């Protein structure tokens, strides 16, 4: 039988671990350098004669 | 009489002129690198036994 093979690995390096920063809905807001607000928005108008 | 003296000056250098960027209420919002939103806020709670 072909069985599922698993290699021996080293303990986790702290430097590898990022998921602590985006596991929750509010964190994916924390992670943004700027959040979208209403006064950011400019709407084009085409004016006819 | 002491009169108000005015020195002769050079034409305006464009490099001097910044006020074009914050003359209007919405521009002082434009000028901010991040705007304050509600999900930014963390409120401390002191829990008694």
Curated annotation (Swiss-Prot), chains A, B:
Catalyzes an early step in the biosynthesis of tetrapyrroles. Binds two molecules of 5-aminolevulinate per subunit, each at a distinct site, and catalyzes their condensation to form porphobilinogen. Homooctamer. Belongs to the ALAD family. Present with 11600 molecules/cell in log phase SD medium. This is Delta-aminolevulinic acid dehydratase. The chain holds residues 1 to 49 of 342 of the full protein.
């Amino acid at each position: 039988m072909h069985t599922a093979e698993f290699l021996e690995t080293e303990p986790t390096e702290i430097s590898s671990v990022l998921a602590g920063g985006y596991n929750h809905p509010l964190l994916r807001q924390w992670q943004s350098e700027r959040q979208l607000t209403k006064n950011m928005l400019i709407f084009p108008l085409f004016i006819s004669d």
